[PDB]
Design a protein around this ligand. Structure first.
Ligand SMILES: CCCCCCCCCCC/C=C\CCCCC(=O)O
Ligand SMILES: CCCCCCCCCCC/C=C\CCCCC(=O)O
Ligand SMILES: CCCCCCCCCCCC(=O)O
Ligand SMILES: CCCCCCCCCCCC(=O)O
Ligand SMILES: CCCCCCCC(=O)O
Ligand SMILES: CCCCCCCC(=O)O
Ligand SMILES: CCCCCCCC(=O)O
Ligand SMILES: CCCCCCCC(=O)O
Ligand SMILES: CCCCCC(=O)O
Ligand SMILES: CCCCCC(=O)O
Ligand SMILES: CCCCCC(=O)O
Ligand SMILES: CCCCCC(=O)O
Ligand SMILES: [Ca+2]
Ligand SMILES: [Ca+2]
Ligand SMILES: [Cl-]
Ligand SMILES: [Cl-]
Ligand SMILES: [Cl-]
Ligand SMILES: [Cl-]
Ligand SMILES: [Mg+2]
Ligand SMILES: [Zn+2]
Ligand SMILES: [Zn+2]
Lengths: 382, 382
């Protein structure tokens, strides 16, 4: 007897590790020490979960993983996809949170940042399938994942995104996706693939798991042959303006789903009309904020630390409507864009900014309970 | 050659590590990344140095070390002192920054925080010697350090203190000096005495140095017999109200020395009249600020994070005069108390608050150059 008829699945963004897969010391992703989203919402009678998917992988890989996290089973990225990008077809295997998920039994999906993109792709696959996989299985036989078939409707009630870079971010184009920083990211992944590691950073399909009897030297040599080093099939690429536009171009509005976005601002206009980070922007986002805020295009400047406002409001090529705080958020098939949260940086959405005393736990509690109320109303107005 | 005729020696406080004795990653003590005090002042033609003395030891041990840091030589804490407290008489040996230091060759001394206390004790020793050591050498023969003899004047031109707890701090009484935290401090010292350690936290005279062939187990066993665990001859005790009052009671004014203090405030009055830390107080001082700011005695509440205003202005019951920022600070024999620096927490004085964007490098450069100007004034008005 949970208060919500459909399970709520929260989906972390880039870099996020949750649950058993978080290091020895590491912030609690959903709520920090400010408001324990999963535990508190459960205490209040809601059925909620935190998905665990690849921290460094592509929206594609993450979306497949999200599917298996919900459904249960062995991750299948698709034969065509695997062959085209050069990684394993099969990945980890998940218990499944709802082994009976199928048209009729729905789920609410809420994504922070990159999580918001991942959620869109996965629903796209359920509804319209994956044509390269359909064609490949046509040509060559074998099994095709039900995720890639198409024709699955009535499985997701709602898509809600928080500080999602629907239109990408310059912090990716000018930093995250540069050569030097991809190497840093991939080296970290190589290291955390070592044979004593208990944490999965989400690129093992690329070879980054040291065998028990393999020397580190041999490991280095083996994985430097991996295609990961030059591939676009990774998070860094997908977070770029181009990477995100590509996803926008292959997604579409499902008319039965309730769509809603939230966006934060944590910059202010300086005398030349550039944006600089507010005191209170989590300090690791200082430089990324400046890079965004000093864009040549004025409307690309205001930002939450790492995502510009124009990126987070809605996918630029998809229908939207500006909504008030008080309107029921119950319209289907159109991005309901919630009023910008002033002073909320990118990570204030998940409560991990331990340096920022203006953003209190009770505020964060209200924000999350507000999302649940909207979700309840989606249910009530079916 | 140098603009200043007398060398400036900067003396760090409690916990401070400088130069080669700082860990692989560690803040630059004098100026952070905001204004590199030693390097910049040298570039501008001033002769300046940063003393290196015990980070965890007593004002006594630190003051002896300061002497040898300047003069050069093997640290001699005194036979009477060693026997009374139960630690080695002899300590490290220093090259010496001014091997010819003697009456006639003077030095300017500037102390941050505890450094301000250490500087007072060392001048006390030069001028008046150390009675227990004089008596001990009377009774028993031996050599006595010239530091403990008394009669050495015309060696220090000036004493300037920044955020010095001249009257102690409740953050020591109610936290720093509790049993639980002395154990933490002493364990850290034991650990950093291990045979692979390249940093000296300043308590080796208590036995915290593992021998090359000693096992860690034997080391633990040996040093747990040390008197350090129950002694008052350590920084934690000296920083308490009582500990500091004892130093106050054995110091006296030198009529040739120019004395000046700076003090910061980084708390604000709440309802009820208690003080709480400003946003912008370096976050590690949050709790210590509250402890101070909630004192029963109202005049002990305003604080810089870890030292209350009333402790920093001047030693209580020593002569002082409130001074303006503009006028020459050129009086001898009396504590010239500079106007409180509004918004400056304890570590803003040394530029290491990397989270605090209100406290700019150019501001800190002005602050230091201001001190040098006063020091130049002292020289010019001899
Ligand atoms: C090391 C590279 C960082 C570069 C930043 C790239 C652009 C980021 C845009 C949006 C990020 C998406 C998910 C962010 C989740 C943040 C989670 C966390 O910090 O614990
Ligand atoms: C670990 C125990 C902390 C207890 C705090 C006791 C009160 C201290 C008052 C004044 C201390 C002297 C100097 C502070 C120097 C700051 C050095 C640094 O931040 O690297
Ligand atoms: C916080 C630790 C930073 C150390 C960076 C140096 C490591 C360079 C690359 C290492 C790659 C690997 O170990 O496989
Ligand atoms: C980051 C701090 C790690 C805390 C570990 C606690 C260890 C207890 C005291 C150790 C004493 C010693 O090793 O000599
Ligand atoms: C020594 C442990 C290293 C943990 C790496 C943290 C992964 C991340 O930033 O997502
Ligand atoms: C460098 C610290 C620990 C190294 C473990 C080596 C195990 C192995 O490779 O067989
Ligand atoms: C831009 C600054 C980067 C420094 C990283 C390590 C921080 C530390 O060791 O305190
Ligand atoms: C895990 C400890 C690594 C070095 C220990 C020193 C060994 C020795 O005392 O011979
Ligand atoms: C963001 C913090 C990561 C540090 C991981 C660890 O030290 O176990
Ligand atoms: C190959 C074994 C060495 C790697 C394990 C480690 O990094 O602790
Ligand atoms: C998102 C992490 C960025 C680190 C860049 C910096 O500290 O300037
Ligand atoms: C291994 C690092 C030791 C830190 C020394 C200090 O806190 O002053
Ligand atoms: Ca913030
Ligand atoms: Ca500060
Ligand atoms: Cl299905
Ligand atoms: Cl792993
Ligand atoms: Cl002498
Ligand atoms: Cl040592
Ligand atoms: Mg060293
Ligand atoms: Zn892939
Ligand atoms: Zn001593």
């Amino acid at each position: 007897q949970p208060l919500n008829k459909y399970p709520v699945v929260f989906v972390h963004g880039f870099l996020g590790l949750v649950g058993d897969n978080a290091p020895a010391l590491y912030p609690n992703y959903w709520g920090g020490n400010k408001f324990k989203v999963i535990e508190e919402l459960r205490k209040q009678g809601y059925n909620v979960h935190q998905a665990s998917v690849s921290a460094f992988g592509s929206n594609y890989d993450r979306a497949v993983q999200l599917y298996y996290y919900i459904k249960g089973g062995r991750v299948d990225y698709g034969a065509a996809h695997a062959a085209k990008y050069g990684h394993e077809r099969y990945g980890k295997t998940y218990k499944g949170i709802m082994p009976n998920w199928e048209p009729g039994k729905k789920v609410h999906l809420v994504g922070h940042s990159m999580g918001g993109q991942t959620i869109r792709l996965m629903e796209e696959f359920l509804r319209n399938g994956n044509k390269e996989e359909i064609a490949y299985h046509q040509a060559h036989g074998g099994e095709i994942s039900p995720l890639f078939t198409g024709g699955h409707n009535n499985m997701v009630a709602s898509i809600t995104t928080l500080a999602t870079p629907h239109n990408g971010s310059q912090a990716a184009d000018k930093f995250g996706n540069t050569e030097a920083v991809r190497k840093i990211m991939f080296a970290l992944n190589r290291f955390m693939g070592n044979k004593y590691s208990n944490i999965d950073l989400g690129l093992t399909q690329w070879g980054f798991k040291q065998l028990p009897n393999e020397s580190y030297i041999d490991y280095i040599k083996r994985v430097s042959k991996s295609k990961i080093w030059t591939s676009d099939d990774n998070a860094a690429y997908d977070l770029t303006l181009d990477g995100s536009a590509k996803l926008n171009n292959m997604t579409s509005m499902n008319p039965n789903i309730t769509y809603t976005t939230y966006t934060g601002v944590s910059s202010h206009t300086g005398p030349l009309g550039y944006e600089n980070p507010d005191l209170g922007t989590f300090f690791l986002m200082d430089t990324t904020s400046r890079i965004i805020g000093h864009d040549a295009r004025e409307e690309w400047r205001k930002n939450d630390g790492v995502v510009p406002v124009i990126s987070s409001l809605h996918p630029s090529n998809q229908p939207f409507v500006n909504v008030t705080n008080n309107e029921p958020a119950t319209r289907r098939g159109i991005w309901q864009v919630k009023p910008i949260l002033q002073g909320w940086d990118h990570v204030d959405f998940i409560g991990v900014d331990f340096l920022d005393f203006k953003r209190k736990g009770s505020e964060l509690a209200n924000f999350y309970i507000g999302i649940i109320n909207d979700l309840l109303s989606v249910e009530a107005t079916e």
